[model samples]
Target: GSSGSSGRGRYRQYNSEILEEAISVVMSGKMSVSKAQSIYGIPHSTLEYKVKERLGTLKNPPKKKMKLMR
Candidate 1:
């Protein structure tokens, strides 16, 4: 596994629609992170974090798990 650092030390500059589409693919669980990044041109770490957000897993979670939070 690679370091969980930001991609290129800066926020990626991609169209939000494309990013959303790539995240949809990630949530579908039918593609690998590397594959999605290759196909969608999104940063690997960025996509991974977005997918985790959709899947309810964050590196720094809140102290309490509320229904809306989860």
Candidate 2:
């Protein structure tokens, strides 16, 4: 039922903690995005933003406030 929310990308393949670890692992310099995702069983692209998100470099997407089409 589309009652509470209808965001598409809200669902995640992995837990936030796993993503956090993936970011840390990649940032460790011992592992690359591909390696971190492969070892952590998460998508390589998934690790792309999570890593950067920790740095607050860029946001994936602006918050969804459902502003009317004005």
Candidate 3:
């Protein structure tokens, strides 16, 4: 499903391990923030947050756990 520039419709997205690698590289001082974002298609801020998570620096944040038994 393709949506217009506004992206009105939801499209199936696959998780990219590349993003995690990119985050690690960026934090390693190999690439610039803008460059990483452009290459990964993820915003710079998002990349920074992800880097924090990847580095285990992200302190306790709220989360939800769900267990399904069928």
Candidate 4:
């Protein structure tokens, strides 16, 4: 009586745009990506990575994901 879910290590990742928006928020308003991350409930790891990796002319952030599940 410990496990309940039917799957394991589910891919709960959000859309690329979602992560991008958070990154923008972090850059804008002078807010740290770390803080904006939590605010947007986004994958902090992803946001921070991209932000630090390349925080210039990131107009089109969403480049991953193209659909959803049933």
Candidate 5:
């Protein structure tokens, strides 16, 4: 059966409460992406973004750092 709605936007993986706790555990350094994703049924990459978004980051992908800095 199809869901009642459709859109191109990416949907949220975990509910607010679950996400809150999961993120806490991740920030605590006790949970790895694989572990958190397994528990929350979220993709690992998505979880990585969750972490990055919370922590913020450089304005761009740091890939150029290796060539530029070295």
Candidate 6:
């Protein structure tokens, strides 16, 4: 659910090493999301997101403007 106003997002709850390990497991082609979750104790959807690289938000991401003022 919500983090209760501490400014911490959903990513804070999971360990980086664990996430990386799970992602690696999926990439190894020998494991599935269900298998990785059972072995690594991470949520199936979360592991999938990590493997898919969709964890961070892209809303309002920084951008550069043309210097020529066109």
Q: Pick the candidate with the highest lDDT.
A: 1
Model 3 lDDT per residue over 1-70, tens place? 9974523335423246757867877888889677877665666777777777777645675467877797
Per-model TM-score, in order, reads: 0.58, 0.57, 0.50, 0.50, 0.52, 0.53
Candidate 5, 38: how far from true, in Å?
0.3
Q: Rate the local accuracy (lDDT) of all candidates.
A: 0.77, 0.74, 0.68, 0.69, 0.69, 0.70
What clash count goes with each model? Answer: 0, 0, 0, 0, 0, 0
* Candidate 2 TM-score versus the reference: 0.57
Candidate 5 wrongly placed segments (more than 4 Å): 1-13, 57-70
Cα lDDT tens digits, model 1, 34-69, are 888867778998888887786766556777655665
RMSD to the true structure for each prediction, in A, is 11.4, 11.9, 10.0, 11.5, 8.5, 11.8
lDDT of 2 by residue, 1-70 (tens): 5655423446546677878888887888879898878766678777886787777656566665776684
Judged by TM-score, which candidate is best?
1
TM-score of candidate 6 on Cα atoms, chains taken together:
0.53
Which regions of candidate 4 deviate over 4 angstroms?
A: 1-12, 57-70
Compared with the true structure, the alpha-carbon lDDT of candidate 5 equals 0.69
Please provide, for model 6 over 1-70, each residue's C-alpha lDDT reduced to its tens digit, 9 standing for 90 to 100. 7664433233445577877888787888779878977677778888877776633444565467655553
Cα displacement (Å) at residue 18, model 5: 1.3
In terms of lDDT, the poorest run of 10 residues in model 1 is: 4-13
Which ten residues in a row are the worst by lDDT in model 6? 4-13
